[PDB]
């Protein structure tokens, strides 16, 4: 077979309901090198003085109105890639009507009915297009339910603009597409950069350019150049590029790109191809629309040949073949991906989820392995008691005095211990100390050395620096303590005997962290990583952050669903095997991330495959770990909310981060959770795993009953001297089936498939299509047999009851049967239907039943059928009914319902 | 007027729907002194050796199986208060039938239609059995739902029986209803008395009688009588009591008295009277009911004879006005009541509520004040850190083995410390000292001393006294110390600066409980509360109960809806500050229980009126002010789980009790929580003042309508000269609005009405009524006339077409402007009606517009309508709504809607 490459039909959805989002900012170490083109403006910019910067950009100081930034939208274009833009409606409804089924299902239907028979093929095309704006109208609306959703959770850029439009402008919060280039903004830390910006102004603005540079250590910024020679566009200290994170500091700079226009945007190579590679989603979604053509291919031929050479009009044949094969065509496969996720998408809406994409849903019904971190997910971050000790062991309110003064003049990223010291410290001593020191200048958390510092003075002739971190990076550097209120030296038997004492206060689940501080005299230069040496330990603050409540019950029920919960923290062992032990959760051996920086990458996933509490982990260590994880069938989620988690989102399946969190973990994750809770996404996941089971029965059984009456009326030909059913009746009947359907993704779900994870396999849909198909067949066959014989059938001057007759059975069929497929079980007694599947299928039986009855069934070549067919239309019906029931044991046995 | 007891038509619903269970097991203190027959048996059975007692009661030591229990149950009765039996189905629908109003119907229709007017009596007596069935029909199945719903939280009683109907026997958990006598339980600490028992064997039980005694000390209860003399029926120690608790220890008993038999049952002269004063919602029904009954006689009789007088034909004209006033009835009270709640009930049993009577709803909707204790609910029951330090602070091993030996041995209720403890405590030092010490004795929780004791000893030589409890109690008794490893004397400086060390403690949210050891020789003697006395004290356990994480963000909640939420603990002052501080709650000052003790009535009312947090408190206590917050128009409801809140609970106007509390506690209480949370106990109280706002409105609505229809006949008569309407149409019209109504329960609630406290006042329904009455009497003199001149039934022998139209209109009227004054809001933009209610309003419309065209409509004397009629109806119910909408807004200025 192969000719993949000549089959066209398939229609794929836009890149924006399904993959992931082609921009998380860092991508991959690119190979080009850029073009050379951009890397002169670039360097321009970053040198062309900020005076003549305004008319270049024709921006000013106070900001852009609305006239102003409408234009420069207008002139540039959008702050979005070019595969985010949505499609027109009017070109959404021309591509979906434009498929070749329709256009062909026209052509051969005015070509059967040209000549003296009109409104014969006016009503086939009328009817056609019905479908066709039906399909339209679905997809429109679950897409725009979609995006949406998706534009609920996206960055915001704070801008000054034009409040009152007479010029008192402001600031506010607009999510990143609007930045137009020339448009002035503000940054603080945990913002990322959302284009490229030309610094007006900076204090200690330090930015993560991990993500392009490759280097992991924060680079300064200021206003104007302080490095010597350009020429290395990305290195520039005034310039800052889309897709980087501000570590701490604050700024004031200026957009000079937007869109592709910036520097990931087509320097990075994302413009250029990178679209060769699908997922496993659009992989399994090509899978079964290769199926299903295959399966026309296959079917819809034959059927043509047979009639044509049996009856010798070939283009009735033709129309009346590809109106059969209609009910398999991949055009509703667009509809089902996109209508029923979207309905669970906005459920999950109401329970505090938002989806970013669609197609995640699919893995977030499958995430058997959750990573997570445990404060914030296992413990509240909240502290309850702390207290400032030293290293005797006595209360010191020099430390907290220490701790304050660290805390409450750095700018980096709020941490819990800032907050609590922050409160904690009494008013009165809060505004001494804020009158007494002041800033100089800051060493941002490096995440390596894991040490901030802050270095204030209170005189123009000394400078104090103060740091505080993680107990052994402290102890690594300090020289000195305050010991019993005076400076003794730091001896070996005292960094014991703190160890010991520090390992006492671990045990209990209580976290370490110490303060140092040097004395220095006054020194213009500017203080960086190298001068945090010979400090002065002063004390340790011993801080707990309880367990929450929910998190027993929560893992206890994720662990019953079958997520194996694991935990990637980057904490003290003994402090992480005390949560683990409080919250339920085993914790067996705990790992040190030395011990995996020299393993094999074999070892390190067998390891993972049989450990789960990982302490002391550098973001590169939790990156390794979540992508050898997946190595055996096992698709593993990710949950953080940090600067360098980023990384450890894109490579696992699915990446979860908290709304409240740094904006680059919201921009690269997928699914966004609006509060740092594991019972919200354990029932997340729950509804996510029955909207997948709802799409999947959805696809089950409008292939399966389509291709039962694809063989129905195959095997019907060679005895009958007339078409079985005319192409409109077949229409009428597939598109009356089309809205019953409407309502399946609102069908209940059996607690039994969604008890595990769901592996979804395509191949599968073949099967249960070849077993459930030839049920309904068999019935059809006896339909026709009671039309040609009972009720005498027997010649074309009397084809067009026996139409009727079959029509009506069809439909109904296509209508009951549902109600005993979507099971494993037996239905209306141990499960049972949503209401509004029940409303569609009673609805769509009346207009079935009424149909040859009404009016237009002369016009629609329909006969009213005698009452003597009404007892035997029902005891067909009860027996496919019984006899599928009984049937699907087999099924069951032989190859299981999921 | 007066006359109130003339009137008895109003009636009242069955005294386990509403009104408090008449069983709290203490009531008051009693002044008849009991019969004396009944305390001459009880002697006896105390006295009565164990060998016969066997054939007494007619019971083995094996158990009871079916057939006995059953017999047992057939001789004797069954365990439940006579008010509490439900009457039987028959008996429920005849007294549902036997109302005057029906009986008076059914007569005077007979009398009217005696002579030669067959078919048209006997049809009116069919309608109004089909209302009288209707009503019977909700009030069962509602009264059944609500009487399933208190089942469900009911205390247990451990039972052998017989489970495998061989003998094998075993032991069950069965409500206290099944509970015969002469059979054989075992209780243990925390479990209520279920009935009068014997006591067969006991372990150190202590049973609280304070209920019936009045003596807040436990009790001893033996096997074998040890007190000296008896002829005190209430102080023997060999008898327990029904509604007295078990404080400590294990026992075996058997039960000897059941039902109304039992001392509480009779002799404290509970089944004596005890039902002359009703409750606050009772008064209000019989208010409504009284309002009724007065309008009924106020209006029906000028009717009756307006139209004797002008139309000569009496008996006609009282079944004419009677079918007018059946819409006014006061039989439709109780199926509101009784049905309304009950919907309300189901859907606070999936918010994890349990509603033991509907009555409770309307207090739990107005609680605006709400006692609560801290542990449980502020803060998480299980404690995350705990340290066993010493005097001078270093970690002391003794002190926790102590406390293993104290909290292992002893029989009472669980402590959270116990808890912990005994998991902190290592596995191989646990079977140590169980294989060491053995138990000797035990002094149980008084409550007065706090102090827990527990005698063990490890040779027969010496015995070592260990106990615990709050630190001030434990040092008030204690005389040495274990302080660096040498017993020294307690001195006053050692007592300083223990008080200071525990205060830091304190302040920082760790209570602290000590432990205190002492030595005595091998003593055969029991000991006592005496021998507490010279205790060595060992060392403090510091322990930190973290808040829950969902505290704060429900009080956050609580206080928004209106809830003020005061605290009453019965510990430090100090941790009760920081805990509050720490969920948010503002505490203000604190007010001890030794202040209170001494203050007056009034001055404790306006302290507890303008304080928040209350510490250090006995239950007396705690009693009191919750007794004199309810002294100005507030609605004080406590939440209390111990053995002494029952007093609290039954004070305050509604008590709540979680699931997972003593017996006692969840008995007394009115309703039930599945879990102590805050957050469930708030989206409760949201869903309780959804279902009385929706009774209320269900109960304006049927008497507002109704009374605009009287008014609309009321001034017709005089100038026409035929019946308005006919009374089989009143009858169709009324049954086809209470089938409308029925979806009313189901209706949506504005938020605007539950934002706030809700105060019924049953006199705002009768000027409700009028301000909403007469707009229906304008449309339908507006209707009267379109029919006399319009259509021209002026004339007797036209008459029935004339009351065809206005019955169209009418019917369409009561169920229309429904959607129109279920609001203080404009209907159907600002806020719509659930779809229930919508469903029921299309039913009942298209029933009423169909009716004058159905084939019965001959039957029922009705005419069909022409179809000019049709617009001028339209225009009618256009305007009607209209000036309904437009005169809301005078009615909610002049008096307003809540
Ligand atoms: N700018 C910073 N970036 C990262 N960590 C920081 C920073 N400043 C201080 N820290 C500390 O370093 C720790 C590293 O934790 P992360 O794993 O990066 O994030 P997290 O949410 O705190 O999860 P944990 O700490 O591993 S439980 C933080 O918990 C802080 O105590
Ligand atoms: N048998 C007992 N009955 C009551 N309290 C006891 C008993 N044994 C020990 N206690 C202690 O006495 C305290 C009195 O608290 P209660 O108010 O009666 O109940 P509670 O649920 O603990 O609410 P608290 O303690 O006031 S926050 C308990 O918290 C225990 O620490
Ligand atoms: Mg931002
Ligand atoms: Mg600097
Ligand atoms: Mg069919
Ligand atoms: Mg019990
Ligand atoms: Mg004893
Ligand atoms: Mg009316």
Chains 1, 2 share one sequence.
Not at 773 to 778: D, E, L, Q, V
Request: glycine letters at 6%; proline letters at 5%.
């Amino acid at each position: 077979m192969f000719k993949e490459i000549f089959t066209r039909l398939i229609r794929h959805l836009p890149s924006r309901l399904v993959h992931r989002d082609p921009l998380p900012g860092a991508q991959q170490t690119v190979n080009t090198v850029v073009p050379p083109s951009l890397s002169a403006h670039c360097l321009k910019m970053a040198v062309m003085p900020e005076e003549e910067l305004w008319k270049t950009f024709d921006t000013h100081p106070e900001g852009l109105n609305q006239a102003e930034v409408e234009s420069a939208r207008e002139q540039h274009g959008e702050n979005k890639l070019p595969a985010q833009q949505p499609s027109p409606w009017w070109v959404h409804l021309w591509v979906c009507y434009r498929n070749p089924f329709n256009i062909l299902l026209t052509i051969l239907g005015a070509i059967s009915y040209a000549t003296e028979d009109l409104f014969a093929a006016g009503v086939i095309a009328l009817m056609v297009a019905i479908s066709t704006l039906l399909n339209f109208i679905q997809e429109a609306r679950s897409t725009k339910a979609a995006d949406a959703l998706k534009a609920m959770v996206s960055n915001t850029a704070t801008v000054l603009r034009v409040i009152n439009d007479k010029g008192e402008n402001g600031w506010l919060e607009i999510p990143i597409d609007q930045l137009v280039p020339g448009d002035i903004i503000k940054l603080a830390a945990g913002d990322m950069i959302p284009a490229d910006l030309r610094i007006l102004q900076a204090r200690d603005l330090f930015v993560a350019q991990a993500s392009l540079t490759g280097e992991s250590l924060p680079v300064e910024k200021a206003a104007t150049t302080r490095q010597p020679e350009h020429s290395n566009p990305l290195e520039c200290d005034t310039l800052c590029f889309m897709g980087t994170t501000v570590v701490s500091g604050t700024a004031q700079a200026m957009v000079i790109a937007t869109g592709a226009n910036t520097w990931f945007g087509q320097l990075a190579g994302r413009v250029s191809e990178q679209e060769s590679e699908p997922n496993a989603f659009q992989q399994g979604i090509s899978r079964v629309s290769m199926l299903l053509i295959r399966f026309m291919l296959v079917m819809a031929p034959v059927v043509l040949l047979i009639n044509g050479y049996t009856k010798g009009d070939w283009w009735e044949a033709a129309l009346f073949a590809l109106s059969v094969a209609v009910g398999l065509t991949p055009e509703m496969l667009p509809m089902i991906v996109t209508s029923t996720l979207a309905r669970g998408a906005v459920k999950l809406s109401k329970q505090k989820v938002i989806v970013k994409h669609l197609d995640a849903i699919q893995n977030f019904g499958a995430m058997d392995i959750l990573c997570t971190d445990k404060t914030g997910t296992l413990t509240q971050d909240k502290i309850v008691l702390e207290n400032h000790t030293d290293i005797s062991g006595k209360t010191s309110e020099r430390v907290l005095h220490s701790a304050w003064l660290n805390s409450h003049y750095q700018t980096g990223l709020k941490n819990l211990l800032d907050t609590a010291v922050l409160e904690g410290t009494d008013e009165e001593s809060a505004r001494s100390l804020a009158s007494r020191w002041q800033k100089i200048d800051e060493i941002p958390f490096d995440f390596e050395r894991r040490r901030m510092s802050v270095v204030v003075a209170e005189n123009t002739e000394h400078h104090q620096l103060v740091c505080k971190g993680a107990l052994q990076e402290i102890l690594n550097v300090c020289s000195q303590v305050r010991h019993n209120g005076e400076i003794v030296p730091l001896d070996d038997i005292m960094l014991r005997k703190i160890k010991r004492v520090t390992d006492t206060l671990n045990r209990q689940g209580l976290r370490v962290v110490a303060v140092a501080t040097k004395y220095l005299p006054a020194r213009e230069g500017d203080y960086q990583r190298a001068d945090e040496s010979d400090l002065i330990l002063e004390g340790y603050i011993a801080f707990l952050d309880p367990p929450k409540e929910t998190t027993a019950p929560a893992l206890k029920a994720l662990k019953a669903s079958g997520i194996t919960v694991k935990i990637l923290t980057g904490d003290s062992e003994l402090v992480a095997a005390k949560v683990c032990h409080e919250v339920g959760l085993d914790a067996g051996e705990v790992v040190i991330g030395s011990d995996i920086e020299t393993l094999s990458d074999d070892e390190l996933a067998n390891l993972a495959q049989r450990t789960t509490l990982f302490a002391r982990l550098t973001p590169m260590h939790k990156e390794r770990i979540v992508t050898l994880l997946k190595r055996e069938g096992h698709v593993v989620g990710f949950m953080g909310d940090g600067i360098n988690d980023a990384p450890a989102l894109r490579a696992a399946d699915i990446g979860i981060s908290v709304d409240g969190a740094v904006d680059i973990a919201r921009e690269a994750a997928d699914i966004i959770l609006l509060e740092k809770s594991l019972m919200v996404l354990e029932e997340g996941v729950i509804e996510g795993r029955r909207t997948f089971a709802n799409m999947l029965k959805y696809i089950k059984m409008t292939a399966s009953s389509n291709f039962g009456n694809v063989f129905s009326v195959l095997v019907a030909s060679a005895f009958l001297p007339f078409l079985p059913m005319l192409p409109l009746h077949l229409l009428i009947q597939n598109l009356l089936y089309d809205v019953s359907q409407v309502a399946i993704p609102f069908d209940n779900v059996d607690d039994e498939q969604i008890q595990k994870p769901q592996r979804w396999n395509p191949a599968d849909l073949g099967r249960f299509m070849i077993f459930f198909g030839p049920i309904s067949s068999i019935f059809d066959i006896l339909t026709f047999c009671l039309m040609w014989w009972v009720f005498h059938a027997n010649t074309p001057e009397t084809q067009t009851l026996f139409q009727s007759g079959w029509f009506v059975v069809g439909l109904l069929s296509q209508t009951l049967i549902v109600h005993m497929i979507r099971t494993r079980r037996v239905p209306f007694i141990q499960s049972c239907a949503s209401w509004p599947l029940m409303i569609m299928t009673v609805i769509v039986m009346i207009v079935g039943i009424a149909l040859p009855f009404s009016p237009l069934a002369s016009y629609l070549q329909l006969q009213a059928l005698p009452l003597s067919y009404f007892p035997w239309l029902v005891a067909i019906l009860a027996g496919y009914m019984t006899l599928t029931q009984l049937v699907k044991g087999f099924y069951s046995r032989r190859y299981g319902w999921q």
